[PDB]
Each structure stands twice: as C-alpha cells, then as structure tokens.
Amino acid sequence: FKLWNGNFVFDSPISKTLLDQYATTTENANTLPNEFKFMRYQAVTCEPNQLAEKNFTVRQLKYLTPRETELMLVVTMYNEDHILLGRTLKGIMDNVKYMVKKKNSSTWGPDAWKKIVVCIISDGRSKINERSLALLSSLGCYQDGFAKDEINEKKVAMHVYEHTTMINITNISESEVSLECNQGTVPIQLLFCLKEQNQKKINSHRWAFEGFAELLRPNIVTLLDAGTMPGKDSIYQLWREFRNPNVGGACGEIRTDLGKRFVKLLNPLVASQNFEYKMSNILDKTTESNFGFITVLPGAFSAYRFEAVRGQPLQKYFYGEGFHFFSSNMYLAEDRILCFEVVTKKNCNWILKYCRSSYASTDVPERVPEFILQRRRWLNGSFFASVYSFCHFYRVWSSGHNIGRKLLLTVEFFYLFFNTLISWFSLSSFFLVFRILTVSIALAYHSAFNVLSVIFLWLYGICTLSTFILSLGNKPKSTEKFYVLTCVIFAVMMIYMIFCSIFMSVKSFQNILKTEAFRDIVISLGSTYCLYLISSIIYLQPWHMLTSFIQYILLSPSYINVLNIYAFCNVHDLSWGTKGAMANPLGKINTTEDGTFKMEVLVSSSEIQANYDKYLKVLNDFDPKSESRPTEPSYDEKKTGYYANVRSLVIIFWVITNFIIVAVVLETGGIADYIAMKSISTAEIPLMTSKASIYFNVILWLVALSALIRFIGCSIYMIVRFFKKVTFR
C-alpha cells in the first residue's frame, strides 16, 4: 500500500461476527458509523513527546468536527490476567453507561461517550497475558498480524490499536467475562496501545501524558490500574470534584476486593490490609484533603486536571534532572512528586481533594513475599517524598495560593513531618514499649513473667537480626516460610503485650477500688481505639472495625519491624556492574574433506620481524612514571556505587538514631554502667528507672494525639461535605 507520511497506519476491518453484533444494536444496519467497522493500527516509532511532531495522530482529531475529550481514562497493565483487566474495564463501561443516561447535565448525555477515551497501555508485548490479548481482541481492539518490529530501519516503540467498540462487559465471574451487545450498551472509544519493551510503569504514564494526552488535550486524566474496578459511578463522582477551578487533582477511596461472599477475610494478611486501607481513607485522606495537599494520589485510582500537571510537575515527574541527593533519588517517589509540584506550582493555586463518594475495589497481595515487595516501594516513596516535601516547604510561599491557604499548607507540612518522624522512630518505639511493658510486669508480679521477659526479648533479637540479614542479602521469595514465621512470632509478641497491658490495667483497678499503667488504658483503648471507632462510624462505614480489626493488630508489629526493615534495607534495588566486555574477533578456518584451506597467512621474514619489533617497542616504552590512569567506572556502574552508598548510609543512620533513644530510655550502651561507676567514684544498676515510665507515657500519648488530630480532620471533612450536601439539595 502506502504509509502515512513516514508512519505505518493500517485501517483494517474487524470481523463479520462483530459487525453483526454491532448491527443488532442499531435500529438500521445500513446506518453504522465508520468507527465501529474498523480498527486503526499505528506503529509509533518515536518518543512520546515527539508524537505530534512526527505526524502521529489519533482517530479523535480526524473527524469532520474534532472531538473534544473530557475524560482520558488511562489503564496501565502488565502481565495481568483477563479477569483483572476485565474487572477494570467493566467499571469503566458501567461509568460510561451511567454518564450517558444522565439528563440534567451540560457535559454528559446521549452523546457523552464521545468525550471519554479509554487508553489501555500495556508494558511490553512479551509480558502481556495472552488471555488479556484474547479479551481485547474479543472487544474488537486487537488483530493479530500487524505488529511490525521495525519501520525503515527504525525500531517501533509502540503498537497503537484504536476502535470504538459496542461490546460491554456485564458480569465478571471467577473465570468468565460476559460480553453482551444488546439495546442497553454504550459505545466505548478504545485506544489500546501496547509497548514492545517493558520500560516500567513511569514510562507508561509518560506515554499517556506527554504522548496521547498532548494529541487528545483532555480536561481530566483519570489514571486507573489493571485490576482496580471503580464503582458504578465512581469515575463520574471523581470528575464532579473538578467543577471548581481550584482542584488540579483528586482521588477516591480504594477498597479491598474481598472476593465472593467476603472469602478473602479468612486470610489474615488480606484482612489487615482491608483495615489499613479503611483507616487511610478515613483519617489520612480526609485530614489531608482539608488542608488541600494529599500526600499521595494513588496510581490505582486518581484523576489529574491536565492543565494542572502540564509543565514543571510532569517535567520533574518524568525526568527530574552529578549524583545529588534530591535529584538522583527523586524516582523513589514515583507519582508522589506529581502531587507536591501541583499544589506548590508557581502562579497557580491548585489543590488536591479526596472524593469520599467514589470508590474502587482493588486486588491486594495474599502472600507475605508479594506483600513485602509492594510495601518496599510504598515506604521508600513515602519516606523520600516526605523528606522532599518538608525540605522544599518554602515553595508553598512562592506559589499563587492566597495567604490563608499558604498558612494551612505550611501547618500541614509540619504535621506531615511530625508523622514522618514518628514513623522513622517506630523501630525503637515498638521495642521500648514491648521491653518496658514486659519488664515492668515481671517486677510487679514475678511468677512466670520473669522468664517470659527474657524469652521474648531473645525472640525479638533473633527475629530482628534475621530480618536485617535476610533483607540486606536475600530475596523474600527465597525465604517465604521464614517471613511468615517472623510475622507469627511478632503476632505472639503482640498478644503477650496486649495481655500484659490488660493484666496490669485490671490489677491497678483492683488495687484502687478495693501510675504509668493506670492511664495506660485511657491512652490506647479509650482515646485511641474509641476515636478510631467513632471516626469509622461518622464516616458511615463502621463494619470493618469488627470484621477486620484483630488481624490488623496482630500484624502491626510486622508492619513496624519486618516491613520497615525490608524497605530501608532495599532502598534502591541494586544490580551492580554486569557488562562482560568482548574481545576483537579473529580469523576463521573452514577445512575441506582432505582439510586443505585458503592460504592468507604471514611467513615473510620482514612481516614477522615487524610484529616482533612491535612487541619489542611496547617493552621499551613502558614509562612507569607516566602511568596511564586506571580505567574509571562507567555510569551505570558508577551510579550503582552511589545508590549503594546512599542505601547503606540510610540503614546505618536509621539504626543508630533509633538505638540512641533506646540507649537513653533503658540506659544501654554502657550508659547505666557509666552512671554506676560515677557513684562508685563518689556499684549497682537499677532495673527500671523513671525515664522508662515518662517515655512510655509520652510515646503512648503521641499515638493518642495523632489519632485525635486525624479524628478532628475526618470530622471537619464530613461536616463540610454535609454542608455542601444540604446546600445542593
């Protein structure tokens, strides 16, 4: 044929079956648009930022009247099953169908499907699941055969398939994705585009933001994820938060998919994540949404105003600039740098909201090795984005916000830093609460609490040493049975700690009715748990405070110890130099039956003598003093050596600063020996001092203060939403 100005663009038909199905939808089979009968394949052979320059287009811009996209739903996928992708697509099509049935809308209506463009971006053709390709092909958005690797000695970077389908998923069973095309389906503009090389997930967003977003010029860019099924109208509810111009990015609630009839609650790891997510979306997102800066907008379900992110925010997201600390480690916070650069944008008053009435059930890990590896990225990004946000807090005052909002933002950044400092010292805080609570009960009532205080300290020491060693030089999949054992041991430690607290609390009552432990029950059961329960109730979602709350408590020591140790030990995912330099090729010999071969060799006396003199002048012009500089590292081998140095100086600084607090409260590290020796000069060490009780009270009142601030934030969020509801009635 002929290509489209240096671009391979083939406009092929779909199939007889799909055409018949689509024709059943319309009242007249003759009047079927030109978008449902074809599937335009393009071979993009350039960078995403050069898409418009290299004359690559999409089908939305080639209509007689160009379509103005209002939502660009972006579904990043990689090796996900057809059930995970089908679950995400069913939510999108339910949202589009809901957004078409609306009547009292100035944006949505009978022709609302032309404003949404669904853009599935798979990460590598070699890694995509064949069942996912089968599902996309059954939707009319993928045909086998047109996947050319190279176009005019230019490698193809992406294969872009686009087809406005009429097929909608209507049911996702455990093994079946039901695809009906009746009179009650809506068209979906599919733009499934899969890469050739697996260039991670940030590059998928680079393709969706610097690439197709530039051509589409959408208003909002909702970033879904493969496996994350939004609600019946959650994307529409998330889009409703952009009615006021100030919002330049919003996020919804992400729930946990508990399976058929809540079957996954039996898994203690899934139930713990359920409660953690519910608390994150009741106390963290609601509190941060009041100030106007949400720490992370989840990549699984979030929406950005395109105008808000275009420019400096996306510039630091993708490139972000030597080996400097804030420029070489900025990639740890993948999409958390996109939230800080939008709120703190020069001459722009952007804020981030959290939509309570827009949910999206996701798929969470069910196994410890898969759960630990996920939270390493989460913890590393959250730590590196909090350090970046606090250090660059002066950029709030260089933005276009008013003074009233700037003050709230700088108050929130201090609170976020205080939370970061609490989470940094959690390794020492848990050990000190455990060690003070199990020693102060062995002094008060002795009996078997004596040897139990030594058994559980040694068990802690062994489980923490082994976690440090298995995290620095071993993989979680290598040792799955030990990480589960460590989680079980820390759960036993938490059970013992709770028992000790209840015992010393009931004994204090029976001593008064017939102190550090007297106010220990109005600090962690009445001021902390009751506030969580009330916050969950006022959120109108209290059913997780009993279904999945014990598994969270029993697994919290694993969150503090196993999870943070592994996150801090694998900061940078090192690989070390692996090049394998190759020598210059030499000649070839291919003998015959008798073995005679060509003669092109050197036998001449002069020719041999010249080589001998060449090897004789090398020995004669060595010149040791002017020794050539030893070959210095490359960049990938020099850059790994810096990531290793940053990684190790973080573990050392995090272990030493946590131990300094343990060395001050419990007087370990020779501190007690030194104090006793001074008294000798002017010979015994006390077991428990007065610093231990003061620290215990302080570290359990900080937990109550954080819960109280989070409760106040949640209440303010709910009250403001209720007032915006009573005024829009």
Ligand X SMILES: C[C@@H]([C@H](N)C(=O)N[C@H](C(=O)O)[C@H]1O[C@@H](n2ccc(=O)[nH]c2=O)[C@H](O)[C@@H]1O)[C@H](O)c1ccc(O)cn1
Binding-site partner at residue 324 among ligand 0V9, ligand D12, ligand C14, none, CB < 5 to 8 Å by type: ligand D12
**Distance separating alpha carbons of residues 432 and 658, to the nearest angstrom:** 10
Binding-site partner at residue 524 among a copy of itself, ligand D12, ligand 0V9, none, CB < 5 to 8 Å by type: ligand D12
The token pair at 437 is 């609570």
**Distance separating alpha carbons of residues 368 and 477, to the nearest angstrom:** 9
**Distance separating alpha carbons of residues 604 and 466, to the nearest angstrom:** 69
Q: Are 662 and 428 in contact (CB under 8 A)?
A: yes
Closer to ligand X by CB, 112 or 177: give it.
Answer: 177
What is the contact mask toward ligand C14 in residues 263 to 302, using x (rule: CB under 6 A)? Answer: ----xxx---------------------------------
**Of the listed pieces 141-149, 247-255, 499-507, 657-665, which binds ligand 0V9 according to CB under 6 A?**
657-665
Smallest distance, ligand 0V9 to C-beta of residue 688, A: 8
Binding-site partner at residue 130 among a copy of itself, ligand C14, ligand 0V9, none, CB < 5 to 8 Å by type: a copy of itself
The token pair at 448 is 């078997």
Closer to ligand C14 by CB, 46 or 563: give it.
Answer: 563
Closer to ligand 0V9 by CB, 393 or 431: give it.
Answer: 431
DSSP letter for 393, please. G
The reply on whether position 525 binds ligand C14 by CB under 6 A is no
The reply on whether position 537 binds ligand 0V9 by CB under 6 A is no
What is the contact mask toward ligand C14 in residues 448 to 477, using x (rule: CB under 6 A)? Answer: x--x--xx--xx--x---x-----------
Closer to a copy of itself by CB, 484 or 651: give it.
Answer: 651
Residue 543's Cβ-count burial label (10 Å; 0-12, 13-18, 19+) is exposed
Smallest distance, ligand D12 to C-beta of residue 314, A: 23
**Of the listed pieces 224-232, 300-308, 525-533, 683-691, which binds a copy of itself according to CB under 8 A?**
683-691
Q: Which residues pair with 74 in a beta bridge?
A: 119, 223
The reply on whether position 549 binds ligand C14 by CB under 6 A is no
Nearest to 126, CA basis, from 62, 197, 55, 192 = 197
- What are the CB-based long-range contacts (under 8 Å, 24+) for 693-699? 693/436, 693/516, 695/432, 695/436, 695/665, 696/432, 696/433, 696/436, 696/437, 696/516, 696/520, 697/516, 697/519, 697/523, 699/429, 699/432, 699/433
Smallest distance, a copy of itself to C-beta of residue 655, A: 6
Smallest distance, ligand C14 to C-beta of residue 419, A: 10
Amino acid at 124: G
Smallest distance, ligand X to C-beta of residue 551, A: 18
**Residue 36 CB partners (closer than 8 Å, separation 6+):** 14, 22, 163, 164, 165, 166, 187
**Distance separating alpha carbons of residues 361 and 44, to the nearest angstrom:** 33
**Distance separating alpha carbons of residues 159 and 146, to the nearest angstrom:** 9
Q: Are 84 and 229 in contact (CB under 8 A)?
A: no
Q: Sign of the C-alpha dihedral, residues 378, 379, 384, 388?
A: positive
Q: How many residues does the chain have?
A: 729
Nearest to 309, CA basis, from 74, 660, 595 = 74
631-650: contacts with a copy of itself (CB under 8 A): 641, 644-645, 647-648
> Maximum CA pair distance of the chain?
115
Query: Which of 219, 429, 453, 658 forms a contact with a copy of itself (CB under 8 A)?
Result: 453
Phi, psi for residue 484 in degrees, rounded to 5:
-60, -40
Residues 482/486/489/495 CA torsion (nearest 10 deg): -140
Amino acid at 516: E
Any idea what the Cα angle at residue 494 is, between residues 488 and 497, rounded to 5°? 145
The reply on whether position 588 binds a copy of itself by CB under 8 A is yes
Distance from the first to the final alpha carbon of the chain: 60
How many chain residues are in contact with a copy of itself, going by CB under 8 A?
126
**In the complex, which residue's CB is closest to ligand 0V9?**
461
Smallest distance, ligand C14 to C-beta of residue 378, A: 18
Q: Are 470 and 479 in contact (CB under 8 A)?
A: yes
Residues that bind ligand X (CB under 6 A): 76-78, 80, 123, 198, 200-201, 204, 225-228, 254, 298-300, 362-363, 374
Closer to ligand HP6 by CB, 266 or 465: give it.
Answer: 266
Q: Which residue has the tokens 């400097």?
A: 324
Other Cβ atoms less than 10 A from the Cβ of 54: the count is 13
Smallest distance, ligand D12 to C-beta of residue 346, A: 21
374-403: contacts with ligand C14 (CB under 6 A): 387
Query: Which of 391, 411, 443, 465 forms a contact with ligand 0V9 (CB under 6 A)?
Result: 465
**Of the listed pieces 24-32, 134-142, 327-335, 339-347, which binds a copy of itself according to CB under 8 A?**
134-142
Amino acid at 476: P
The reply on whether position 445 binds ligand C14 by CB under 6 A is yes
Closer to ligand D12 by CB, 255 or 435: give it.
Answer: 435
**Of the listed pieces 157-165, 242-250, 357-365, 655-663, which binds ligand 0V9 according to CB under 6 A?**
655-663
Q: Which residues pair with 155 in a beta bridge?
A: 150
Smallest distance, ligand C14 to C-beta of residue 379, A: 14
The reply on whether position 431 binds ligand 0V9 by CB under 6 A is yes
The token pair at 375 is 């939270």
Smallest distance, ligand D12 to C-beta of residue 325, A: 4
Query: Which of 262, 537, 673, 723 forms a contact with a copy of itself (CB under 8 A)?
Result: 673
Binding-site partner at residue 646 among ligand C14, ligand X, ligand 0V9, none, CB < 5 to 8 Å by type: ligand C14
Residues that bind ligand HP6 (CB under 6 A): 266-268, 290-291, 391, 394, 397, 402, 404-405, 408, 410, 451, 480-481, 484-485, 488, 713, 716
Any idea what the Cα angle at residue 238 is, between residues 160 and 68, rounded to 5°? 45
Residues that bind ligand D12 (CB under 6 A): 324-326, 387, 391, 422, 426, 429-430, 433, 495, 497-499, 501-503, 506, 524, 560, 657, 660-661, 664, 703
Mapping DSSP to helix (H, G, I), strand (E, B) and coil, where does residue 292 land? coil
Closer to ligand D12 by CB, 192 or 559: give it.
Answer: 559
**Of the listed pieces 260-268, 347-355, 359-367, 472-480, which binds a copy of itself according to CB under 8 A?**
472-480
Q: Are 210 and 132 in contact (CB under 8 A)?
A: no
Q: Are 34 and 193 in contact (CB under 8 A)?
A: no
**Of the listed pieces 264-272, 306-314, 345-353, 465-473, which binds a copy of itself according to CB under 8 A?**
465-473
**Distance separating alpha carbons of residues 285 and 254, to the nearest angstrom:** 11
Nearest to 313, CA basis, from 289, 297, 290 = 297
**Distance separating alpha carbons of residues 211 and 95, to the nearest angstrom:** 25
287-326: contacts with a copy of itself (CB under 8 A): none
Other Cβ atoms less than 10 A from the Cβ of 66: the count is 10
Binding-site partner at residue 668 among ligand 0V9, ligand X, ligand C14, none, CB < 5 to 8 Å by type: ligand 0V9
182-221: contacts with a copy of itself (CB under 8 A): 196
Query: Which of 55, 327, 611, 634 forms a contact with a copy of itself (CB under 8 A)?
Result: 611
Q: Are 341 and 312 in contact (CB under 8 A)?
A: yes
**Distance separating alpha carbons of residues 251 and 358, to the nearest angstrom:** 8
Residues that bind ligand C14 (CB under 6 A): 267-269, 325, 366-368, 387, 421-422, 425, 429, 445, 447-448, 451, 454-455, 458-459, 462, 466, 479, 481-482, 484, 487-488, 491-492, 495-496, 499, 554-555, 642, 645-646, 648-650, 652-653, 656, 660-661, 663-664, 671, 691, 694-695, 698
Residues that bind ligand 0V9 (CB under 6 A): 427-428, 431, 435, 457-458, 461-462, 464-465, 468, 655-656, 658-659, 662, 666-670, 672-673, 685
